[PDB]
Amino acid sequence: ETHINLKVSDGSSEIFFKIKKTTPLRRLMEAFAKRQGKEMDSLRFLYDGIRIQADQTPEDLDMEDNDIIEAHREQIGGSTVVTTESGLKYEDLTEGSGAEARAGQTVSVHYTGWLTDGQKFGSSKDRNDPFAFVLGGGMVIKGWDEGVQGMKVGGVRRLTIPPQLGYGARGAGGVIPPNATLVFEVELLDV
Ligand SMILES: COc1cc(CCCOC(=O)[C@@H]2CCCCN2S(=O)(=O)Cc2ccccc2)cc(OC)c1OC
Secondary structure (H helix, E strand, O other): OOEEEEEEEOOOOEEEEEEEOOOOOHHHHHHHHHHOOOOHHHEEEEEOOEEOOOOOOOOOOOOOOOEEEEEEEOOOOOOOEEEOOOOOEEEEEEOOEEEEOOOOOEEEEEEEEEEOOOOEEEEOOOOOOOEEEEOOOOOOOHHHHHHOOOOEEOOEEEEEEOHHHOOOOOOEOOOEOOOOOEEEEEEEEEO
8 A cells, every 4th residue: 555544633623634655744734734724833743642743754654544643732832721710711822022901902913713623713814904802892702802801912822712702602604603612813913
């Protein structure tokens, strides 16, 4: 056999590939990162608990048909996920500089949002149009009004938003179903 099938899983997104055994894994890794809107740089791919480098081939790693590659985010700065009283979770992927965003300020952000199955349902980067709103003003979902408070400019924060802080029993956009937990990465551009 010259080719094998591989599954890459990050716990949410799973993507299936068929790769020639002598092909470097770079293209597969890039494909998985692109599907999440992310750069390959912000991800780590493991096979049999060992990190894969882009130049390595399935042959190099003795991979077999239907083997699994696990995908993770690694932030060099570390990972601390905080649960709030409301059940919101936040994780500062990057901490910003300067003053913290406060309720009542108009902020400008970039964001991407996904379902817990990894499906991207929206991004400001799609129209390359930052999104502005009045923080704590009730014009965005509750999880955002709560979760963007405390961010600093240049910060990127990952919000995990339970449905009562999102779209609840209604869902939205022909994409988000009832009772869906939402994941956003939000970049604070200005406050
Ligand atoms: C369910 O409650 C509300 C929902 C909205 C939705 C419009 C604003 O959108 C958002 O809150 C979020 C965060 C800010 C960026 C855009 N989104 S969004 O979730 O990505 C919008 C979306 C796009 C595609 C499919 C489904 C949903 C506005 C609201 O206020 C006018 C709401 O009431 C507080």
